[model samples]
Target: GSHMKYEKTLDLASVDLRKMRVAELKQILHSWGEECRACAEKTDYVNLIQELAPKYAATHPKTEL
Candidate 1:
């Protein structure tokens, strides 16, 4: 027996990249200090922000606590 799984296609073109173009995007990513080569190429904002757990936790503490 097997359980069901689900998947959906993502449409990123709808996301507003107006605030971060290719060049400004480079500046914002410099904090990674030479370790984020793949992110530089792809610029996955969700993944990039996800990696900043400490910064996020500072302002948004866990509600369960």
Candidate 2:
């Protein structure tokens, strides 16, 4: 009974990318129908996501507080 992992509600902007694994990064891109062309390292995945996330998240509501 060791397989108790649960799915997280992905909030790309609100989440910490560094704490995630490569699989999670790939999952994110796959869900978005995007691929990282030259991802040689985990950091590369983070960079690709950084470059891509804004395109989808730019319209996120701002909190002026």
Candidate 3:
């Protein structure tokens, strides 16, 4: 299905990472072949994504508005 395929490649740059919970972050990381076992808090998830997302966004540039 389309929705399943969409979930396979998560577009983190288009999402509100601050509003997402650790569980959602775990799910996203899992899709990227990463584990979230050490992320015991929301801040951990945020920090990890902040560090990782820039690399993802750099290669997959967003359209300038």
Candidate 4:
């Protein structure tokens, strides 16, 4: 209920990707089982996160610790 509402607002576009550290992005990708696919540095992770976030939010419906 409320969790789904929260998920809708959790897309990558809502995040300040530029302000995030590369290591943080790497860690996030690792959690998503995407560490092996990560490359291109900050821009890469930013795009990847943007591409995956909506789906991840819809499926997982929870925040990363």
Highest lDDT scorer: 2
C-alpha lDDT score of every prediction, in listed order: 0.44, 0.76, 0.69, 0.66
For each candidate in turn, the TM-score is 0.32, 0.69, 0.59, 0.58
**lDDT (Cα, tens digit) per residue for candidate 1, span 1-65:** 68986422122343444444555434444544523556544357445644443443255654433
Regions more than 4 Å wrong, model 3: 1-9, 60-65
Comparing 2 with 4 on lDDT, the higher-scoring candidate is 2
lDDT of 3 by residue, 1-65 (tens): 45544344367767787887676777777665766577778878778877677556466654433
Provide the lowest-lDDT 10-residue window in model 3. Answer: 1-10
| Candidate 2 residue-wise lDDT, 1-65, digit = tens | 76777555347867778888898778888777898777899899888887677666677743443
Candidate 2 lands at a TM-score of 0.69
Task: Report lDDT (Cα) of residue 49, candidate 1.
Answer: 40
TM-score of 3: 0.59
Model 2 has an lDDT value of: 0.76
Top candidate (TM-score): 2
